Design a protein around this ligand. Sequence first.
Ligand SMILES: [Ca+2]
Ligand SMILES: [Ca+2]
Length: 82
Amino acid sequence: SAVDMDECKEPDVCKHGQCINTDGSYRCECPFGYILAGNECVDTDECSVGNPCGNGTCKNVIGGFECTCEEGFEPGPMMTCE
Ligand SMILES: [Ca+2]
Ligand SMILES: [Ca+2]
């Protein structure tokens, strides 16, 4: 059999996003939290906002970000201070 070129599944296209195999092309579509650097899809710098925790400091993570509120608290995976 023969399948049309994926175009996005290639190591030089998307490589980390929800693409859309078209008839003669594709369409990279990174999720909410990622971006597109011309073809490679990955996470952006969420800590570039300003400590989403509430007072501590922000850090860059995947699907969101990380943070270290004033030592003595308990943050989360990628949400805010809690
Ligand atoms: Ca295709
Ligand atoms: Ca991030």
